Every structure is written in C-alpha cells, then in structure tokens.
Amino acid sequence: STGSATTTPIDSLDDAYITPVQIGTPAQTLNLDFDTGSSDLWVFSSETTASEVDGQTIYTPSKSTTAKLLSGATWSISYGDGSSSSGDVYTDTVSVGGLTVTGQAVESAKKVSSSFTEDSTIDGLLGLAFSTLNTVSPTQQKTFFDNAKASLDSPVFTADLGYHAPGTYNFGFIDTTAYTGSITYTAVSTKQGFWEWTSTGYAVGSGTFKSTSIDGIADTGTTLLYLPATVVSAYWAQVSGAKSSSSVGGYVFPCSATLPSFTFGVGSARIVIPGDYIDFGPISTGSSSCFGGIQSSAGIGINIFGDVALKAAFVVFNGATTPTLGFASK
Numbered sequence: 552s553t554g555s556a557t558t559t560p561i562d563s564l565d566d567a568y569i570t571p572v573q574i575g576t577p578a579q580t581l582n583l584d585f586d587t588g589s590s591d592l593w594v595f596s597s598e599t600t601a602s603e604v605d606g607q608t609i610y611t612p613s614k615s616t617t618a619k620l621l622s623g624a625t626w627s628i629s630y631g632d633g634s635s636s637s638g639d640v641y642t643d644t645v646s647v648g649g650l651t652v653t654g655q656a657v658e659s660a661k662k663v664s665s666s667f668t669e670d671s672t673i674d675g676l677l678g679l680a681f682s683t684l685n686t687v688s689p690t691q692q693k694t695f696f697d698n699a700k701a702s703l704d705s706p707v708f709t710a711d712l713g714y715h716a717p718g719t720y721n722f723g724f725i726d727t728t729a730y731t732g733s734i735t736y737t738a739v740s741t742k743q744g745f746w747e748w749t750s751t752g753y754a755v756g757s758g759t760f761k762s763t764s765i766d767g768i769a770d771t772g773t774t775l776l777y778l779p780a781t782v783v784s785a786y787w788a789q790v791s792g793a794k795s796s797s798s799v800g801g802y803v804f805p806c807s808a809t810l811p812s813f814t815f816g817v818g819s820a821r822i823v824i825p826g827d828y829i830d831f832g833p834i835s836t837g838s839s840s841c842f843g844g845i846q847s848s849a850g851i852g853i854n855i856f857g858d859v860a861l862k863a864a865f866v867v868f869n870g871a872t873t874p875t876l877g878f879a880s881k
C-alpha cells in the first residue's frame with residue numbers, strides 16, 4: 552500500500568504545517584501537525600476541557616463505530632517549547648492520504664496547554680519519531696508509521712515541505728519526480744528515539760564550506776533551524792545590524808536586510824537554504840525588527856533541523872531494519 556497527503560502551512564510564515572487525517576467510522580477529518588520529533592498521535596476531542604478548546608475540530612469517539620477505549624491507558628507529553636497535553640486513549644481506524652491503519656492508538660486530550668488552545672488551526676499532532684518515545688502508559692503504543700510499515704510497498708515516508716506553499720507527505724514510496732539530482736542517504740541513530748543524524752558541515756552565503764560534524768535531528772514539528780552557537784554567530788555576523796536579543800528570545804535582524812543563504816552538508820552533498828526561508832518577519836506587528844529562522848541550540852541540548860532546513864529538501868525517512876535519512880535538492 553501507499554498514501555499521499557498534502558501538507559499546508561498554517562500561516563504566512565510557515566510556522567507549522569497541517570495535514571488532513573481521517574479518524575473513525577464515519578470518518579472525522581482533523582488537521583494534524585505531522586511531527587517527526589515525537590511519537591504520539593493525539594487529538595482535541597469531545598473529552599477536552601471546554602475552556603481549552605477555541606476553534607479546533609474535535610474527535611468524538613462516541614460517534615465512531617470503530618472506536619474502542621484502550622482501557623486503563625493514559626498519556627502525557629511535554630514539548631521543547633514548554634507546551635503540553637494529556638488524556639486517555641482509544642483505538643480506531645486512521646487514514647492518511649488513502650493509507651489506512653486499523654487499531655491505531657488515538658490519544659484523546661483531556662487537557663492541553665495554552666499554546667495549543669490559542670492555535671485554532673492545529674487539531675492535534677501525529678508523531679513520526681520512533682515508537683520508543685510514545686508516552687502511553689502502562690502499554691506503550693506504536694506510531695501510525697510503525698503500524699503501517701509492514702503493509703507499505705517500501706518501509707519509508709517522505710517529507711516535501713513547501714516554502715510559503717503546500718507540500719506533500721508520502722508513505723510507502725519515493726516520488727522520483729519530486730526532487731532534482733540524486734538522494735544522498737546518511738546514517739541514523741535511534742538511541743534517543745529521534746531521526747538523529749550527523750551533518751558534515753555548513754556554509755554561509757557564498758562563503759567557503761566548513762567541514763565539521765553537526766549531530767542533530769530531522770524534526771518536521773520544529774519551525775526553525777537550531778544549531779550550535781558558533782555556527783549561528785557565523786551566520787548572523789553576515790547580516791548588518793543582526794544581534795541576539797535576550798528580551799525577544801533569539802537573533803533578530805533589521806527587516807530591511809537581504810539575508811544570505813545557509814548551506815548544510817549531507818555526506819558529500821549540499822542542501823542550500825535560500826535567505827528568504829530564514830526570515831520570520833516582524834517580532835511584533837509593525838516592528839522593523841525581524842525574527843531569524845536560524846537560532847542557537849545552546850539552551851535545548853540537541854541541534855534541530857526543523858522546517859527551515861527540511862523545506863529546502865526532499866527528505867526520505869527510511870524505516871528499514873537499519874533506518875537512514877535521505878536528502879535531495881528540489
């Protein structure tokens with residue numbers, strides 16, 4: 552089998568991407584944030600505290616003839632931005648882009664933190680990291696990809712995120728028309744539960760490439776590119792007036808600037824992020840200070856190749872017995 556679904560930016564900045572997902576019988580379509588950095592499929596639901604729902608579409612398990620309570624199971628997750636959610640668990644039929652999994656754990660939120668409530672465009676998350684990170688207790692549950700894997704034509708999914716435009720998540724096949732040149736594959740460590748890999752270096756603009764190993768994760772659920780402070784300082788030093796602002800929470804730059812590109816290495820290959828992809832717009836409405844799309848990972852404990860990086864590439868998440876990542880230009 553295969554599946555193919557379009558993923559759409561939630562706003563004009565590409566702050567996140569939503570993909571329609573069919574849950575239950577008859578189908579209830581919710582728009583989920585596909586997150587290769589986590590491993591829970593959770594949704595706003597008829598069980599979510601009413602004051603914490605503000606415009607989201609909810610899953611109502613009582614209206615699904617295929618829903619079954621997963622008796623005794625609970626879940627609770629916290630993310631790197633400090634947001635969180637928790638609740639109980641149903642199994643149900645879940646389809647993405649024509650690919651159907653029966654018996655998928657659908658984690659129904661009883662509580663969500665304020666940042667989820669305040670984002671009316673995201674109805675939940677669909678985790679695509681390794682199932683070892685799934686938070687369901689006392690019986691850990693498998694991701695949608697892990698459940699689908701054996702049925703897929705090939706044990707892979709691909710992320711093709713757009714810059715200020717829709718893109719595609721495919722399951723089970725590699726669309727050879729969706730990228731240019733060849734795909735360069737690179738080793739993955741699953742020791743932390745992530746799609747963790749080692750970039751071979753970077754360049755700023757037209758500058759010379761610096762060969763240096765940068766361990767990090769491919770994370771569709773993180774907006775920006777988070778890299779070591781040395782690398783990030785070298786980038787922003789090429790932008791007149793850019794500075795790190797503690798009050799804002801990262802590097803800002805004059806909105807009048809033209810940003811240089813940023814290149815990262817994948818083995819001997821190179822992925823070029825155009826400068827415009829690094830512009831996250833005014834820090835507040837009407838400000839002439841703009842927020843940068845490359846930020847330091849110093850406070851995080853891990854480097855994160857988030858959407859800013861991934862949207863410059865066609866990315867293969869290869870879930871074979873030994874997982875690997877592939878990157879192509881597009």
Ligand SMILES: NCC[C@@H]1CCCC1(F)F
Pocket residue numbers: 586587588589630631632768770771772773853855
């Ligand atoms: N997108 C899931 C959240 C990520 C995983 C590693 C660091 C982080 F919390 F930011």
